Write a protein that binds this ligand. Sequence first.
Ligand SMILES: NCCCC[C@@](N)(CC[C@](N)(CCCCN)C(=O)O)C(=O)O
Ligand SMILES: [Mg+2]
Ligand SMILES: [Mg+2]
Ligand SMILES: [Mg+2]
Ligand SMILES: [Mg+2]
Ligand SMILES: [Mg+2]
Ligand SMILES: [Mg+2]
Ligand SMILES: [Mg+2]
Ligand SMILES: [Mg+2]
Lengths: 296, 296
Amino acid sequence: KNIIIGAMTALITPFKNGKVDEQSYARLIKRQIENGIDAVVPVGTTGESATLTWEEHRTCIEIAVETCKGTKVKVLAGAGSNATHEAVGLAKFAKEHGADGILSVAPYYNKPTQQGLYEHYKAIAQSVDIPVLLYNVPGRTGCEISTDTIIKLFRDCENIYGVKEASGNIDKCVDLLAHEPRMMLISGEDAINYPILSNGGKGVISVTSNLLPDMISALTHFALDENYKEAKKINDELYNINKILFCESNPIPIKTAMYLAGLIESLEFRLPLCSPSKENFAKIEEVMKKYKIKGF
Amino acid sequence: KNIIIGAMTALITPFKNGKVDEQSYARLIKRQIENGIDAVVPVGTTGESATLTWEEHRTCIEIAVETCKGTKVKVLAGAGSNATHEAVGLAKFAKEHGADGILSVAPYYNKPTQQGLYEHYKAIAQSVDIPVLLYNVPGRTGCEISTDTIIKLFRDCENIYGVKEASGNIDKCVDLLAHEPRMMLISGEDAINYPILSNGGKGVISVTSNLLPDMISALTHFALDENYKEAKKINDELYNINKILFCESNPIPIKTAMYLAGLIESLEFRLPLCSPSKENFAKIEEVMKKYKIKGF
Ligand SMILES: NCCCC[C@@](N)(CC[C@](N)(CCCCN)C(=O)O)C(=O)O
Ligand SMILES: [Mg+2]
Ligand SMILES: [Mg+2]
Ligand SMILES: [Mg+2]
Ligand SMILES: [Mg+2]
Ligand SMILES: [Mg+2]
Ligand SMILES: [Mg+2]
Ligand SMILES: [Mg+2]
Ligand SMILES: [Mg+2]
């Protein structure tokens, strides 16, 4: 299988005066490239996929592809939807506009059955010839892609190559790689990046790496190189910021931190997201001061 | 406050050859009207809102409005979204095309904070002059509108008049009506329709009423008259069908039941929804044989 692995960043989407700040978006991606990241994920949850227009969603994928051209950093485009026809449309757009692969979240809100998830992802995978990474995040979607469904999809669909797990369930991570060791398990939960990698996971799709790309990429590369002592050391050092970045729903804390570090111009969200409480604003700033934050 | 209460139905959306079967939709609404239902909810979760196009979503609202003219029956249009700008657009469409009010589900997938939920619903409520019913269903959305947030919205926004609860939490139902007894608490969970009404809830938005509208209407109206013995008896009789209609994710069982009773022509869903397992198909039919199902 063709794969996209390693240290990857779920890119925030900066807004300025209610619009995507496209120059800032490109500048943030260049900063990721300069700090050892292996791939970027435009317009995931962290990128406020729910509130972008179709035009903005397309535009962010295009900026990621164009900014990474000639750098060997890959683009794993956010392409999921809770409507299969929408997810297929996004997959085809990503393929036709030069993405290296797609990330495709389990359908949210309408709670498909395992049979429905299988048919959903089969339709998506049959619509493109680029790698497809499943994405399980039951706390946000209301459904779980079971281990059996993930493994069947990996075995039945040639371009489905693994899953990004954001489920707080290291037992399931063992289950997955004990029964199907050929798949690429990707951490979608920063606090437990190292335990997932040490069990044979092959990368991360990170929130924290927006702010600390050098640290997350180093953690991942230490682990893939089997230097588990140094990967664990970074995972331990990052625990405090990894947790504070979820004191309110992602990406409210990470965008706040990026604004506090001077990396984006305006602390703007699209409703229903909004700025954090004054108390959490202060907690985020306090935890950030313990870390060296790379500039541009 | 202007209110929409009583026995209400979350309408299924029938498809035939991949398109909304508009004549069937109108016929199903007339069947609800003739069996004592007080309001219909086009294009909620049960109506597969996630997978309808915008044009189909608009069309279903219009068919409901047109079909209810000249009757007591109100149209509480499904108008929620996880993007505030989409929810405002739907609210304004429903208002301008003659809906009596709107149902507005809490944003799914992006997990807004309570502050964000307040700002979301404030924007929706300020955009129209028709009643707005909140809708809390954390198992599908990944977030909870807290009692405090619901109560603030009811007190601060003229048109927000209550909430449809689908949370399996009678303690919260007590909390709501003990601290704000003027709100309209609406059951969004058929199995516990009677306990919610007997605590002072004033209606239901029902899945089961698609199949058994006369029974749900009788239950509700007995309860509203404090004829609790009769209301409880119907609630108890309905428990088995109320549970089997969730043996797979709603609306897979209810659409299957409507097909099994000859009330729709084709058992078609939009992916990622799909037909139930053959075993659940048989279980649904067996439970259906225990109930008296009105025709057209
Ligand atoms: N990334 C750009 C598009 C975002 C669209 C949407 N807000 C809503 C998606 C939708 N399937 C639209 C249904 C429209 C008709 N009811 C949903 O709300 O479920 C989402 O997927 O989060
Ligand atoms: Mg590299
Ligand atoms: Mg097993
Ligand atoms: Mg979060
Ligand atoms: Mg401080
Ligand atoms: Mg038409
Ligand atoms: Mg009328
Ligand atoms: Mg309280
Ligand atoms: Mg009476």
